[PDB]
Design a protein around this ligand. Sequence first.
Ligand SMILES: Nc1ncnc2c1ncn2[C@@H]1O[C@H](COP(=O)(O)OP(=O)(O)OP(=O)(O)O)[C@@H](O)[C@H]1O
Ligand SMILES: Nc1ncnc2c1ncn2[C@@H]1O[C@H](COP(=O)(O)OP(=O)(O)O)[C@@H](O)[C@H]1O
Ligand SMILES: Nc1ncnc2c1ncn2[C@@H]1O[C@H](COP(=O)(O)OP(=O)(O)O)[C@@H](O)[C@H]1O
Lengths: 249, 746
Amino acid sequence: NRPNRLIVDEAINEDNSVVSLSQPKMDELQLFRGDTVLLKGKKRREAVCIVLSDDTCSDEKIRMNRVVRNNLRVRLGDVISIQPCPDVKYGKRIHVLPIDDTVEGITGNLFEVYLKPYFLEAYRPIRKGDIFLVRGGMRAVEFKVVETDPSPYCIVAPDTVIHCEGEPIKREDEEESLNEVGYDDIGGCRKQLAQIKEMVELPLRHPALFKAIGVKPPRGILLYGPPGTGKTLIARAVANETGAFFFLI
Amino acid sequence: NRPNRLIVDEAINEDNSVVSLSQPKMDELQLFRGDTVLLKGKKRREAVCIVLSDDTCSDEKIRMNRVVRNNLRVRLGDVISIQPCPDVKYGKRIHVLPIDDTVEGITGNLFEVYLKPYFLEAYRPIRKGDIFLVRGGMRAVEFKVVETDPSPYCIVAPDTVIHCEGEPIKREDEEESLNEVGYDDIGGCRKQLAQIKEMVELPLRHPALFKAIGVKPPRGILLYGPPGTGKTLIARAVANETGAFFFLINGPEIMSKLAGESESNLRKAFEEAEKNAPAIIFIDELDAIAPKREKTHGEVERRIVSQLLTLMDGLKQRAHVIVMAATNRPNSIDPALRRFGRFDREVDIGIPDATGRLEILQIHTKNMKLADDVDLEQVANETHGHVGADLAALCSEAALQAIRKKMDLIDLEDETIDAEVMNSLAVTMDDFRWALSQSNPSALRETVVEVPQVTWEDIGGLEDVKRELQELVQYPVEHPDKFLKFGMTPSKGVLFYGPPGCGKTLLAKAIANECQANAISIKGPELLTMWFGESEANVREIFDKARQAAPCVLFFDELDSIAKARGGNIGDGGGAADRVINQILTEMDGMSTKKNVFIIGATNRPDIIDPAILRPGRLDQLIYIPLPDEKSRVAILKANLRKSPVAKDVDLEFLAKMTNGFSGADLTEICQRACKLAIRESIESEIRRERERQTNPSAMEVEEDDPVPEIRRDHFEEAMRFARRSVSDNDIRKYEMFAQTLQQSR
Ligand SMILES: Nc1ncnc2c1ncn2[C@@H]1O[C@H](COP(=O)(O)OP(=O)(O)OP(=O)(O)O)[C@@H](O)[C@H]1O
Ligand SMILES: Nc1ncnc2c1ncn2[C@@H]1O[C@H](COP(=O)(O)OP(=O)(O)O)[C@@H](O)[C@H]1O
Ligand SMILES: Nc1ncnc2c1ncn2[C@@H]1O[C@H](COP(=O)(O)OP(=O)(O)O)[C@@H](O)[C@H]1O
């Protein structure tokens, strides 16, 4: 029922900095053309950037650059909460450095060979965590967050200073994406999983709600059984899916 | 001598601003129940309230609740004045304000829902400074009447306005809290609570009084029992209500730190308690600090034990601190701890009975909005193996299931949660059933110590046996003077022998219930467990539990179980004496008759038991429980069928006359058969009725009618065709010849 709760679907503009529109929806929003719209999804990672390079497709499904699925999302069928937040500050500039596929070949400055021809009159309305493709060549290389002089995201400008002293890395970021075990990874304990869910849903998903009442919560759980029955896996999946901070003692 | 002041006492009526008084002292003060009356209180206050006339309260003590005893700044053991107030006034606008942090985490004009019903029709005589309190929606919060448009004290009238505003103000330091635990929070240990009260009232409430005399106080209390039986709750409530400074010494907290650090912490705690005299030192999990001396492996643990011993001895020589301890078993702690002067009196907290479980459930549901179908009597009667905190977890599970059924399914995308939805939550019977069945581990597996619910009416026949047992049990304990007058020591044991199924167990339960005495039934499985495990020492603490529950009926069901496992009639080449039976004999010889702990033994094979247990002074009375005759069988059937609804067409006299030589438990098996056939008939009728009309697609076609709510004579006839003769006639002949050979033997 939430108006800005709408699916996201295929995208065709290979540049991630573009975010779609839906004129019937734009009338609902105040979506203005400029730097940024805050399109909010899962895990707090967003794809914030210039807007309105769409309305080619049908409505009820926002076109968002597929590269903002691995980030900000997982798969199709998801939903975006698009709400404008244009006119960001203009700090120094946003980091410039590649991550994986640039050490393979001539490196030079890692900015003025392949990436420079893209921060042109669209000076990176971004949000740290927006990952995309940008090159001056084979057209498949990532652009990741490394540094942060301004905490909030900004719109870069020339005359600034950048240091590509940083080195491209491994997929620490790709491994980070591959984590957070879930209930789909639990089998053979469906009744036990449901019991754990009904035990830990109220204390974790509703902390203030339970703080309002004066009932005693279940604060001790004894998962006992043969070794290798997924006890730590069950605990990790429950903590990750419910959002509770998991400490592996 | 100036009967204008009066003593304080607790209250059975919980409604605020209400009291109850002796009936004759209504003309003395010369005022009536409805007559609103003002009552004085120190620090220069007086609070007005309604009056009432009762009897249970003495002619010298008032009854009241913690709220007024808080605003009046007075505890029990004190005395105040009183005065009628026929000059009372109708309270106009008298502003109130939510005075606590409890206001935290809430929203809405809760004033309306909490107050308007609370004040409605109550004619609450209210004065300034009132700190009244009201409870709803899983929460309990109060208010203070800050303004009195007419001052100082007035009545409430429905017309009176409420401009309900203000910001939660800060309670001063003078007042206190009701969350602090009190005796109202203790259930299942009423006798134990009274014992603790009579132990700690003089040392704490009267420190200078006891300092005047030179008697030795009880400065060591050993609260032992199963974990979760409210030992720390009992200690906290006793310390808070009596005003003694409570220091929660935790065994893990003590010996969690370094050895020197642990000893320093113990010394600092004892010094602080001595400085805050009168104070209560409570040591839960004392076995952790103080294990058995032969068992404490680490030298650090022994050093900590000795440090605790020295600190408590220093309290004994020069202090005013009462030390309390909690442990699973009294023997688990060091025997040096229980030395005289250190831990003189040990209080067996034990387990709550059906009434105790009911009290605990009522305590835990006091602030819980629960429906009318809860029938906590039925829950408590069903609840077995749950002690204290087990029932607390049961109530918490029921509440959590109700919340997961309501919140997780109702308020998802509508709007943020407010107070209206949470205060509308209600706990149903299904939640309690689910908590009982699926989500409750019963931590109790040892012997039960409670007054059994089986009465004389639950037993059919055996009138002569009933009378003889009533004599042998009640007369020593109900008329001790008569026994002392004659030169005969009362008997402390009786043996029940006869065919199995005649109700020896019920005889013991009924004689325990008639005397209102706890019954500890040690069945044959327990005796065989002690025999096979080669642990005869368990009888020692069994008898200790029986003695601590005085008056108690120590029942030994199937006393011949060990003699039957170790061979039959003649058995092996060995004798009849057994190690567990021997320990029972030793304990009975060591048991004083005055301790009014009666030992009842049931033997289905009296000829195989050792005659040493039949020696005079232990089980000299051999009461024969004969196979029920016609009248006894009729009475047994009447007693059994009182629970199961049976149709009036049943003919109990005829059924008894068919059942020749049938035992009582065989008649209950007769109901098992017939009553179960009735249950199966009802179930099959229900399922066939469900299946028959599902084919017809009729929107309105319901021929609702109960198939049968009772048990007809057809079920009993089918049971007769199924159930057969009770026992072999040879066994009955053996019992009758044993009865004929009650003397001229050995
Ligand atoms: N019930 C299960 N369902 C799916 N995978 C399981 C299950 N139990 C164990 N595994 C898998 O076993 C692997 C190793 O087990 P893991 O390290 O999670 O410990 P664990 O099985 O929880 O151990 P323990 O029983 O000793 O606590 C993991 O890849 C985990 O996914
Ligand atoms: N007899 C009782 N009546 C009411 N509540 C109880 C009782 N026994 C235990 N509880 C509840 O159990 C909780 C913890 O029990 P606790 O006092 O720690 O038991 P123990 O002292 O035996 O360890 C307390 O919050 C208390 O409310
Ligand atoms: N005389 C009786 N009157 C009423 N009920 C009886 C009587 N005798 C036995 N019962 C009930 O029938 C069942 C069978 O009795 P049982 O316990 O075998 O007797 P005993 O304990 O003497 O062996 C018991 O559960 C008991 O509650």
